[PDB]
Amino acid sequence: DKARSRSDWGNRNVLPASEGDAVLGRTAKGAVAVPEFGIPQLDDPVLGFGPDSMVDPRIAEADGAVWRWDAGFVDESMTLASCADISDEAVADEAF
Amino acid sequence: MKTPITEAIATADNQGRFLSNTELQAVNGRYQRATASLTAAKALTGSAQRLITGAAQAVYNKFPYTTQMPGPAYASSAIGKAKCARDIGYYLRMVTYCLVVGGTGPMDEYLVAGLEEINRSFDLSPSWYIEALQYIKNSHGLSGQVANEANAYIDYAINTLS
Amino acid sequence: MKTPITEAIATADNQGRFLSNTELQAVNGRYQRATASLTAAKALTGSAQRLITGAAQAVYNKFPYTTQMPGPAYASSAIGKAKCARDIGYYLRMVTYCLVVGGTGPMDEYLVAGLEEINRSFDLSPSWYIEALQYIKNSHGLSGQVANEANAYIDYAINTLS
Amino acid sequence: MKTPITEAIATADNQGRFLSNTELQAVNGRYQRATASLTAAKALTGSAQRLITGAAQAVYNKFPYTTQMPGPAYASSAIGKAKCARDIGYYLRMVTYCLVVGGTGPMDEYLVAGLEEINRSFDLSPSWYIEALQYIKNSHGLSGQVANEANAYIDYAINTLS
Amino acid sequence: SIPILKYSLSTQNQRVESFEVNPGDEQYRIYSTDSLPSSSEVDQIIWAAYRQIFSEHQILKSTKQPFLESQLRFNQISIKDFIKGLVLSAPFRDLNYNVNNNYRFVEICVQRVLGRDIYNEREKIAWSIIIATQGLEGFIDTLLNTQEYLSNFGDSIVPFQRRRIIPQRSKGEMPFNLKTPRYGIEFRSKLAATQFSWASPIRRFRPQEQQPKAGDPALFLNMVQEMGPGL
Amino acid sequence: MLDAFAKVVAQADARGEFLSNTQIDALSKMVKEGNQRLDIVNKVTSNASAIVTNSARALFAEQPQLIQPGGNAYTSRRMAACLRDMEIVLRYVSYAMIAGDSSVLDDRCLNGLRETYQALGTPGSSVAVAIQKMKDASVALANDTTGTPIGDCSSLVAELAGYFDRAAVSVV
Amino acid sequence: MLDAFAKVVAQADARGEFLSNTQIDALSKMVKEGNQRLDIVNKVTSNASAIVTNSARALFAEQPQLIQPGGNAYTSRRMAACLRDMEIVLRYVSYAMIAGDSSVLDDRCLNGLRETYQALGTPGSSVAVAIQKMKDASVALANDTTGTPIGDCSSLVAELAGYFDRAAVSVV
Amino acid sequence: MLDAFAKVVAQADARGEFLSNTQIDALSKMVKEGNQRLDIVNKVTSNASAIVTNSARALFAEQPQLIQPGGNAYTSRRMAACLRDMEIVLRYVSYAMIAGDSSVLDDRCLNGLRETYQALGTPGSSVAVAIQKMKDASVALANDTTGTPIGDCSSLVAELAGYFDRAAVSVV
Amino acid sequence: MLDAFAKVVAQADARGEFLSNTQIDALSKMVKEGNQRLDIVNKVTSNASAIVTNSARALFAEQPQLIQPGGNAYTSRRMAACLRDMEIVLRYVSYAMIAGDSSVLDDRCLNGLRETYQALGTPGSSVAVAIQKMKDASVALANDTTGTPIGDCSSLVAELAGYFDRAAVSVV
Numbered sequence A: 001d002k003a004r005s006r007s008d009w010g011n012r013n014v015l016p017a018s019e020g021d022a023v024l025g026r027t028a029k030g031a032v033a034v035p036e037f038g039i040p041q042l043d044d045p046v047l048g049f050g051p052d053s054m055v056d057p058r059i060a061e062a063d064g065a066v067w068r069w070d071a072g073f074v075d076e077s078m079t080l081a082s083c084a085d086i087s088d089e090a091v092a093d094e095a096f
Numbered sequence B, C, D: 001m002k003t004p005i006t007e008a009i010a011t012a013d014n015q016g017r018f019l020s021n022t023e024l025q026a027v028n029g030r031y032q033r034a035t036a037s038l039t040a041a042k043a044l045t046g047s048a049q050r051l052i053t054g055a056a057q058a059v060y061n062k063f064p065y066t067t068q069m070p071g072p073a074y075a076s077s078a079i080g081k082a083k084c085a086r087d088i089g090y091y092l093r094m095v096t097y098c099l100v101v102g103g104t105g106p107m108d109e110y111l112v113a114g115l116e117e118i119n120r121s122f123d124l125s126p127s128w129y130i131e132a133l134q135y136i137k138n139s140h141g142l143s144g145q146v147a148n149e150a151n152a153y154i155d156y157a158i159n160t161l162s
Numbered sequence E: 001s002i003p004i005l006k007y008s009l010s011t012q013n014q015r016v017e018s019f020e021v022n023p024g025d026e027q028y029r030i031y032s033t034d035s036l037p038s039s040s041e042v043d044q045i046i047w048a049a050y051r052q053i054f055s056e057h058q059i060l061k062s063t064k065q066p067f068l069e070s071q072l073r074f075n076q077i078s079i080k081d082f083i084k085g086l087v088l089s090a091p092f093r094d095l096n097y098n099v100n101n102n103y104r105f106v107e108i109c110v111q112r113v114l115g116r117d118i119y120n121e122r123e124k125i126a127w128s129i130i131i132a133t134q135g136l137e138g139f140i141d142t143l144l145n146t147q148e149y150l151s152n153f154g155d156s157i158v159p160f161q162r163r164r165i166i167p168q169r170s171k172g173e174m175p176f177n178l179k180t181p182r183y184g185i186e187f188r189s190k191l192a193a194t195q196f197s198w199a200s201p202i203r204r205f206r207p208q209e210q211q212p213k214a215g216d217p218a219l220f221l222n223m224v225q226e227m228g229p230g231l
Numbered sequence F, G, H, I: 001m002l003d004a005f006a007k008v009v010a011q012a013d014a015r016g017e018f019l020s021n022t023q024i025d026a027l028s029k030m031v032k033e034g035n036q037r038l039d040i041v042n043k044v045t046s047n048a049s050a051i052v053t054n055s056a057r058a059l060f061a062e063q064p065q066l067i068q069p070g071g072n073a074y075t076s077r078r079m080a081a082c083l084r085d086m087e088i089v090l091r092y093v094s095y096a097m098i099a100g101d102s103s104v105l106d107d108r109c110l111n112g113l114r115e116t117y118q119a120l121g122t123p124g125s126s127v128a129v130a131i132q133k134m135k136d137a138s139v140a141l142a143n144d145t146t147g148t149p150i151g152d153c154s155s156l157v158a159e160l161a162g163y164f165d166r167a168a169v170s171v172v
C-alpha cells in the first residue's frame, strides 16, 4: 500500500529511497530541506573556492555518505575509476 | 561542533543514558535564541563586502607600516592586499556560521584551532586582526538582542587572538 | 546532582573554557521551562495527601494479596500499611525535587542508586511501585505543559523500575 | 643498542625535539675516544687465538674437576672442551664488538640478556667464566689508554656474572 | 633476564599533536577524583570505568564489585587501582580471558587500558609472553607502569580511547568495543554455543519494506496531523 | 558529530561560501518545528522500556528458536545482553532525532556492528527484525496525540522512522 | 557541585519535607532574575583576556619585587603560571555566578590552594591583591549599561563581588 | 635503533665472525669525518624553522589549490598540521644524519605514513614535493662555508640527500 | 577452561538435556582411577626441570643449526627463550592431564601458536621435535613403579602421550 498513515511509518514503510520521494518539507534523511548554496565570500581566482579547489574531506562525513549503511555511500571498487586505462601502453603490452 | 544540540547528546552519551529533560531544555534554549541569532547572520552577510573592504582600510590606517615594508608577510604588494582582504572575510564568515549554528562551533574547528602556530610561522601579527574585528564590532549597525548576539562572537574571536 | 546548570559547567570545565553562548543558551532553556515546572511542583505539593492515600489504595485493589498474605514484606498488618504509604511519599517527594531543580538529579542520588539491592533483600516488588506511580500520573489533575513536566519525571521513575 | 649516538637520539626523540648542542657534544665525545677503542679492538682480534686457548687452559688449572668429572656440563670429553672454550670466544667477540660501537650495547642483546637462565639450566658455574676473563685482563698485552678501554668492557662482563 | 622483544612503531593519531585549544563535542570527558566529586558524581566515575574495561553488556548486577567501589569512596585506592582491580576481577577472567588466546587478549587490554590500538602484529607477540610467564597480575602491572599510562592518565583519571576523531571530520575511527568484541572468529565455531555462522534476511509474504513513489498521498499528508487557522 | 544546522555549514565552507537568504529561510523553517521535535523524543524516552520489552516478547513468540537451548538469546546473560542491544539502538535513534541527521548514529553505533555480529555468531538478520518492531512501536507512540496541543507533526514521524530504517539495513 | 536550586533541595531531603510555598516563590524570583544574571556572566566572559592582562599589569607595576630577578614571577614559565592562576580563579567565579552558590568554586578550585602556595613559596598575600584587582575590573563592567535594557541589577553585582572576596581570603 | 657502527656489528654477529682489518679501517674512516658530519647537522637544525616555513611558502605558490577553499591545507588546523608533518620529517632526517643509517627514519617516522595519508585524503604526491623542497633548502645550506674550515664533504651531502629521497618516495 | 566433567555439562546444556545414566557412570569411572591420575602429574612435575633441559640438550645437540650465530636461538635472548617455550608447553600439558581433557591446552597454549612462530621466523618443525623429545621423557617417568602400588595405568599413559602429540601437530 502507499504510505498513508503517520502510524505506518514504524509498521510498514521505511524511508524515501531517492530525494524526490521525500516527505512534504524535508530531505531523504528526514531533516529540513535547505538550499545547498550560500553567498561566496572572496570571489577571487588565486584565493577562493575556484573550480579546482579540492574537495573537503569533511563534506562526506558531514553528509553521512562515508558510512556504508547510509544510501549516499557509493562504493568505487566496481566503477570505471577502478578499471585500468587501456590507453596506457604499459598495461596493453603486458596484457597482450 | 559546539552546537547546543551536540553538547546535549554528548552529556547523555557520556553516561550511556536516554535524553531526559536535562538535555531537552538545552535544545529548547537554542530555539528560543535562534530568532535573533538568525537575523544577525542575514544582515552581516548582506553587508559582507562593505564590512570587509572597510575593515581592511582600518588596519592600513592604524598600521601604515604594513603597506610600506617589503617582505612576504606584509600587504605591500597586490598579492598581499588580496590575501589581507581574504583573511578579513575569513573571520567574518566564521562569525556568521556561529550565528546560524548557535554556539562557537565553526570558529573553533575552522579558525581558532592552530591559529597561534600559523601566526608565528608566517609572522602575522595578531594585533592586525583585533583591529579588523573591532571595526566590524562598531560598524555592523545592528541593535537590541540582534547586536547582542553578533558582538558575542566578535568578542569571542578577540579573546582568542588576545 | 545532575541539573541543567551543573551539566553546563561540567562540559565547560572539561574543555577549559569560559561560559560561551553554547552554555548561556542552555541555562536560558532551564529558565524558560522553569515557569511550567515550578507550578507543577507547587500543585503536587499541595495535593500530596490526596495522592499518597489514593496511590496506596490503587496497589491494594490491583494486588490484593499484599493485604492478605502474612509476612513482613506485605501490607497485611498496620505496621506494614504505614510503611507502604511512607514509600509512596518518598517517590512523590523526589518527583517534586526534580521539578524544582530540572533534570533527574535528586532521585538519581537519593533513590535509584542502590534501589535494586533493597527490593531484592526485603522482597519488595517493583511492580507495586509502578502501579502506584501510574495512579499519580493519571490523578494529579494537571494540564498543558504543566502536566507535561510532571509526567516526564513520573515516567523516569517507572523506567528505572521496569 | 646502547651506542652513545642512539642514546642521544633517544633523549631528543622522547621530548619530540631536534638535536641541540647537548647531543652533538655527546657524539663528539664518542669520536674523540674512538681512536683508542679501535686500536684495542684490532689488537685483541689479532691476538685472539693466543687469548682463547690461554684463558681456556687457565680455568682447567684453577678448577681441575672440570676435566675429570663426568657429565655433559664438564670439559672431560672432546665434545665438552669445545663449549667452555667457545664461550671463551663468545665473550671475547662481544668485547671487541663493544669497542667499535662504544658502550655496552652489543653484549647486552647478544650475551647478557637471558644469561642467568642459561647458566641455571645447563648447570654452568659463572665462576668459571670469571676466571677466564681475569686471564684476558691480565695478559691482553695492552697499555696506556688502549688498555683502559679494553678493561672497561671486561669488567662489565665480570660485574654481570658476579 | 629475558627483556621484552623490540617492535616497530607505526603512524597513529595520538603520536602527534592536535592543535586544539577549545575542544568541542568530541572531547571525551575526563573522569577524575582530582575535582573532588560528591557521592552522585563518584557514581559516574565508577560507571565510566566499568564501561571502559568491561563492555556495556557486562555491567550486570552479578558483575559489579561492591567492595572495590567502597574503597574508592573512602580514598583508599586510586583510579589506577580501580582499573587494575577490574582487570584482575573474577568476571573479567571468566567472560574475557577464558574465551581469547594470549594475542587477542593483549590487544583488548591495550585498547582498553592504554586507550590506543596496537602498533603492529609483533606488539601482540611481544606482550603475550608477559601473560604466559608471570600471569595476569604481572601483565597488568607492567602495562600500567609504562610511561604511556602515567603521562596520559596518571593515577587519578579513567582511561579513554585517545584521539579517536580528527577535529574537522564527522566519521572517526571505530570504537574499541565495536572493533574488538568478547570473542572472535576463533572460539566462535563451536566453543561458544553457535550454529551456521550466518543468516539470510527474513522472508515474508507481506513485504514490510515498500518504498513510497511519487504520487502516493502520504507524501502530501504532510499537513496530515493538523490544519492551520486564519482568514 | 553534526546536527542539521551544522551539516549546511560544512557544505557551505567546503566551497568557501556565505549562506544565502534562501538557505537561512530554510533553517528558520527547521526552528519552527522545534517544539514538535522535542515532543517526539520525549514520547520515545518516557516509554523506552515498553518499547524494548514488548518488542522483544514479540520477537521470540514468532522466532522461538532464539531462546531454545542452543540459541543465541538462551542462557540469561545472553538474554540480558540481547535487551541491552535494543536499548542501545533505541538510544542512538533518539540521539539522531534531536540532531536532525544520523551521524552520531552512523559512527558511534552502526560502524562495525555487522562485522561484530559475524564474529559472535549472532543472527544479524534477526537483529534487524528486532529494530523493525521497535520502529512501529515508536511510530504508533509518536502518532498518539496524548499530552500534546493540536497541530501537525507528520513529516517528523516519517523522519523518525527513517533512522530506524538506517539502523536496520546496516546490520543485515 | 551544586547550584542554588539544588542547594535548597539537599536541605529539604535531610528533614524529609516537601518545599513550602515560600521556598517555591523565592525560587521563582530567582528565575525572573535569570536574564539579568546571564548578562553579567556574558559581560565577564567576553572581556576575560583583558580582565586578566590589565590586572596582572597593574599588579607588577605596584609590586615590582615579583618580577625582579629572584621573584616569584620571574623566568617566564613562572610568569605563564601566574597568568594561568588568574584565569583559573576568574573562570571558577563566573561558574559560581550562573550557579548561584559557590560550591564549584570551593571544591575544584579553592580546596587546597593555600596549602599548594605554601608548598611552592608563592606569596599568598600577593595573590589576594591580584584577585581584588579583577574584582573591581569586573564589578565595573557589570555596572556598564551598554547594550542592555536599563533596569536595576545591583543585588547580583553585590553577589558577584562576594565570590571574589571568597577566593581572596582563601589563599592568604 | 641502529647507527652506522652498530650496523656493522649486526652483520658480523650473524656470521659469528670477528671484524676484519678492512672493516676496522672502514670504521676509522667514519670517525675521521665525524667533525664534518656534526657540522652538517648543526647547520640544518639551526635553520630548521626557516627550512620548513619557506619550503611551504613555495609549495602553496606552486600548487595554489591547496589553500583555496576545499584544499587540503585550507583551514588554520589543516595549515598547522602541514607544517607539523614537514617538521617531523625534517626531524627524523636529522636523526638519521648523525646515526649514519636510516633505521630510526624508517621505524619511527615512515612506518604506515603512506596508508595514513590515503585514509585522510591528503595528496601524497604533494607531500613528496614539499620534502624535495626541504631537501635542496638543506643541501644548499650544508654546502655553505660560513663558519666551517674549508674542505670537501660532498659524500656526506650525497648521503643527506638520500635520506630526503627515501622519505619522499615512501610517502606516495 | 573445562575439565572432563564440565565438558559433558557444556555439551548437555546446548541440547537442553539432563545427563544420562551412562554419562554419570562414565564420569564415576574417572573418579575411580583418580589416584593414578594424580600419581602421573606427581612424577612429571617433580622432574619438570630435567625433562626440559635434557631434551633441549638432545635438541640443541640434535639439530646443530639452532644455536649457530645467525640461527634463531643464537644469543642469550634467543636460547633462553627456547628453554622457556618448552617449559610453557610442558606446563600446559600437565594442566590437561589433571583436567582430563585438552581444553586448557588448546585455549591457553596452542591457539594461534603456529602463526606466531611463522611471524618470528622460528622453524616450527623443530619445535615439534622438542615436544616429541619431551613426550617420551615423561612417558618413561610415568611408567616408573617407584613409590606406588603396582597396577595398570596404560590407558592413562596413552592419554598423556596424546596430549604431547596434539601439541606437536598444532605447532608446525
Ligand SMILES: *CC[C@H]1/C(=C/c2[nH]c(/C=C3N=C(/C=C4\NC(=O)C(CC)=C4C)C(C)=C\3CCC(=O)O)c(CCC(=O)O)c2C)NC(=O)[C@@H]1C
Pocket (backbone or CB within 6 Å): E055, E056, E057, E058, E177, E178, E181, E182, F066, F072, F073, F078, F079, F081, F082, F083, F085, F086, F088, F089, F108, F109, F110, F113, F116, F120, F122, F123, F126, F127, F130
Ligand atoms: C536481541 C538482540 C540479538 C542478540 C544480541 C547479542 N549481542 C551480544 C553482544 C554484543 N553486542 C554488541 C553491540 C554494541 N556494542 C556497542 O558498544 C554498541 C554501540 C554503543 C553496540 C550496538 C557488542 C560489542 C557485543 C559483544 C561484547 C560483549 O558482549 O561484551 C550478545 C552476547 C554475546 C556473548 O555471548 O557474549 C547477544 C546475545 N542476540 C540475539 O540472538 C538477538 C537476535
Ligand SMILES: *CC[C@H]1/C(=C/c2[nH]c(/C=C3N=C(/C=C4\NC(=O)C(CC)=C4C)C(C)=C\3CCC(=O)O)c(CCC(=O)O)c2C)NC(=O)[C@@H]1C
Pocket (backbone or CB within 6 Å): A057, E010, E011, E012, E013, E014, E015, E016, E017, E018, E166, E168, H066, H072, H073, H077, H078, H079, H081, H082, H083, H085, H086, H088, H089, H108, H109, H110, H111, H113, H116, H120, H121, H122, H123, H126, H127, H130
Ligand atoms: C604539507 C604537508 C601535507 C599535508 C599534511 C597533513 N597531514 C595531516 C594529518 C596527519 N599527519 C599525520 C602524520 C604523522 N603522524 C605520526 O605519528 C608521524 C611520525 C611517525 C607523522 C609524520 C597523522 C597521524 C595525521 C592525522 C591526525 C591529525 O591530523 O592530527 C593533515 C590533517 C588535516 C586533514 O584533514 O588531513 C594535513 C593537512 N597535507 C597537505 O595538503 C600537504 C601536501
Ligand SMILES: *C[C@@H](*)[C@H]1/C(=C/c2[nH]c(/C=C3N=C(/C=C4\NC(=O)C(CC)=C4C)C(C)=C\3CCC(=O)O)c(CCC(=O)O)c2C)NC(=O)[C@@H]1C
Pocket (backbone or CB within 6 Å): C056, C059, C066, C072, C073, C074, C075, C076, C080, C081, C083, C084, C085, C087, C088, C090, C110, C111, C118, C122, C124, C128, C132
Ligand atoms: C506500597 C507499599 C507496599 C509495601 C511497602 C513496604 N516497604 C517496606 C520497606 C522498605 N522500603 C524501603 C524503601 C526506601 N527507603 C528509602 O530510603 C528510599 C528512598 C528515599 C526508598 C525507596 C526500605 C529501605 C525498607 C526497609 C526498611 C524500612 O523502611 O522499614 C516494608 C517493610 C518490609 C520489612 O521487611 O519490614 C513494606 C511492607 N509493601 C507492600 O506490601 C505494599 C504493597
Ligand SMILES: *[C@H](C)[C@H]1/C(=C/C2=NC(=C\c3[nH]c(C[C@H]4NC(=O)C(C=C)=C4C)c(C)c3CCC(=O)O)/C(CCC(=O)O)=C2C)NC(=O)[C@@H]1C
Pocket (backbone or CB within 6 Å): B021, B024, B025, B028, C033, C145, C148, E225, E226, F034, F035, F036, F038, F039, F040, F042, F142, F143, F144, F145, F146, F148, F149, F150, F151, F152, F153, F154
Ligand atoms: C507532534 C508529534 C505532536 C504534537 C506536537 C506539538 N507540540 C506543540 C507545542 C509544544 N510542545 C512543547 C513541549 C516540548 N518543548 C520543550 O521545550 C520540551 C522540553 C522541555 C518539550 C517536550 C511545548 C512547550 C509547546 C508549546 C509551544 C507553543 O506554545 O507554541 C505544538 C504547537 C503547534 C505549533 O507549535 O505550531 C504541536 C503540534 N501535537 C500533536 O498533535 C502531535 C501528536
Ligand SMILES: *[C@H](C)[C@H]1/C(=C/C2=NC(=C\c3[nH]c(C[C@H]4NC(=O)C(C=C)=C4C)c(C)c3CCC(=O)O)/C(CCC(=O)O)=C2C)NC(=O)[C@@H]1C
Pocket (backbone or CB within 6 Å): B033, B145, B148, C024, C025, C028, G035, G036, G037, G038, G039, G040, G042, G142, G143, G144, G145, G146, G148, G149, G150, G151, G152, G153, G154, G156, G157
Ligand atoms: C544588570 C547588572 C545589567 C542589566 C541586566 C538586565 N537585563 C535585562 C533584560 C534582558 N537581558 C537579556 C539578555 C540575556 N538573556 C539571554 O538569554 C542571554 C543569552 C543568550 C542574555 C545576554 C534579555 C533577552 C532581556 C529581556 C528579558 C527580560 O526582560 O528579562 C533587564 C530588565 C530591564 C530593567 O528592568 O532594568 C536588566 C536589568 N541591565 C543593566 O542595566 C545592567 C547593566
Ligand SMILES: *[C@H](C)[C@H]1/C(=C/C2=NC(=C\c3[nH]c(C[C@H]4NC(=O)C(C=C)=C4C)c(C)c3CCC(=O)O)/C(CCC(=O)O)=C2C)NC(=O)[C@@H]1C
Pocket (backbone or CB within 6 Å): D024, D025, D028, H032, H033, H034, H035, H036, H038, H039, H040, H042, H142, H143, H144, H145, H146, H148, H149, H150, H151, H152, H153, H154, H156
Ligand atoms: C662540509 C659539509 C663543510 C665543512 C666541514 C668541515 N668541518 C671541519 C672541522 C670542524 N667542524 C666542526 C663543527 C662540528 N664539530 C663539532 O665537534 C661540533 C659541536 C661540538 C660541531 C658543530 C669542528 C669543531 C671542527 C674542528 C675539527 C677540525 O678542525 O678538523 C673540517 C676540517 C677537516 C675535517 O674535519 O675533516 C671540514 C672540511 N667544511 C666545508 O667547507 C663544508 C662547508
Ligand SMILES: *[C@H](C)[C@H]1/C(=C/C2=NC(=C\c3[nH]c(C[C@H]4NC(=O)C(C=C)=C4C)c(C)c3CCC(=O)O)/C(CCC(=O)O)=C2C)NC(=O)[C@@H]1C
Pocket (backbone or CB within 6 Å): I034, I035, I036, I038, I039, I040, I042, I142, I143, I144, I145, I146, I148, I149, I150, I151, I152, I153
Ligand atoms: C600408574 C602410572 C602407576 C600406579 C598408580 C597407582 N596409584 C594407586 C594409588 C595411590 N596413588 C597415589 C598418588 C596420588 N594420590 C594422591 O592422593 C596424591 C596426593 C594428593 C598422589 C600423588 C597415592 C597416595 C595412592 C594410595 C591410595 C591407594 O592406595 O589407593 C593405585 C591403586 C592402588 C592399588 O592398585 O593397589 C595405582 C594402580 N601404579 C602403577 O603400577 C603405575 C606405575
Ligand SMILES: *[C@H](C)[C@H]1/C(=C/c2[nH]c(/C=C3N=C(/C=C4\NC(=O)C(CC)=C4C)C(C)=C\3CCC(=O)O)c(CCC(=O)O)c2C)NC(=O)[C@@H]1C
Pocket (backbone or CB within 6 Å): B056, B059, B066, B067, B072, B073, B074, B075, B076, B079, B080, B081, B083, B084, B085, B087, B088, B090, B091, B110, B111, B118, B122, B124, B128, B132, H057, H060, H067, H073, H074, H075, H076, H079
Ligand atoms: C591583512 C589583514 C594582513 C595580512 C594578511 C596576509 N596573510 C597572509 C597569509 C596567511 N593567512 C592565513 C590565514 C588563514 N588561513 C585560513 O585558512 C584561515 C581560517 C579559514 C585563516 C585566518 C594563512 C594560513 C596564510 C599563509 C598561506 C596563505 O597565503 O594564505 C599573507 C602572506 C604571508 C606569506 O608569507 O605568504 C599576508 C600578506 N598581512 C598584512 O600585512 C595585512 C595587514
Ligand SMILES: *[C@H](C)[C@H]1/C(=C/c2[nH]c(/C=C3N=C(/C=C4\NC(=O)C(CC)=C4C)C(C)=C\3CCC(=O)O)c(CCC(=O)O)c2C)NC(=O)[C@@H]1C
Pocket (backbone or CB within 6 Å): G066, G072, G073, G077, G078, G079, G081, G082, G083, G085, G086, G088, G108, G109, G110, G113, G116, G120, G122, G123, G126, G127, G130
Ligand atoms: C600569579 C598572579 C601569582 C603566582 C602564581 C603561580 N602559581 C604557580 C603554580 C601553581 N598553581 C597551582 C594552582 C592550581 N593548579 C590547578 O590545576 C588548579 C585548579 C584546581 C589550581 C587552583 C599549582 C598546582 C601550581 C604548581 C604547578 C605549576 O608549577 O604549574 C606558580 C609557579 C610556581 C613554581 O615555582 O612552579 C606561580 C608563579 N605567583 C605569584 O607570584 C603571583 C602572585
Ligand SMILES: *[C@H](C)[C@H]1/C(=C/c2[nH]c(/C=C3N=C(/C=C4\NC(=O)C(CC)=C4C)C(C)=C\3CCC(=O)O)c(CCC(=O)O)c2C)NC(=O)[C@@H]1C
Pocket (backbone or CB within 6 Å): E004, E005, E102, E125, E126, E128, E129, E132, I066, I072, I073, I077, I078, I079, I081, I082, I083, I085, I086, I088, I089, I108, I109, I110, I111, I113, I116, I120, I122, I123, I126, I127, I130
Ligand atoms: C625452542 C625449543 C625453539 C624456539 C623458541 C623461540 N621462541 C621464541 C619466541 C616466542 N615464543 C612465544 C611462545 C608462546 N607465547 C605464548 O603466549 C604461548 C602460550 C600461548 C607460547 C607457547 C612468544 C610470544 C615469543 C615472542 C616473544 C619474545 O620475543 O620473547 C624465540 C624468539 C626469541 C627472539 O629474540 O626472537 C625463539 C628462538 N626457537 C627455536 O629455534 C627452537 C626450535
Ligand SMILES: CCC1=C(C)/C(=C/C2=NC(=C\c3[nH]c(/C=C4\NC(=O)[C@H](C)[C@H]4CC)c(C)c3CCC(=O)O)/C(CCC(=O)O)=C2C)NC1=O
Pocket (backbone or CB within 6 Å): D059, D066, D072, D073, D074, D075, D080, D083, D084, D085, D087, D088, D090, D110, D111, D112, D115, D118, D122, D124, D125, D128, D129, D132, I057, I060, I067, I074, I075, I076, I079
Ligand atoms: C652469547 C651469549 C651466550 C652464552 C654465554 C651462552 C652460554 C651457554 N653455554 C652453554 C653450555 C655450556 N657452557 C659450558 C662452559 C663451561 N663449563 C665448564 O665446565 C667450564 C668451566 C666452562 C668453559 C669455560 C659448558 C661445559 C656447557 C655444556 C653445554 C652442553 O654440553 O650442552 C649453553 C647451552 C647450549 C650450548 O651452547 O651447548 C649456552 C646457551 N650461549 C650464548 O649464546
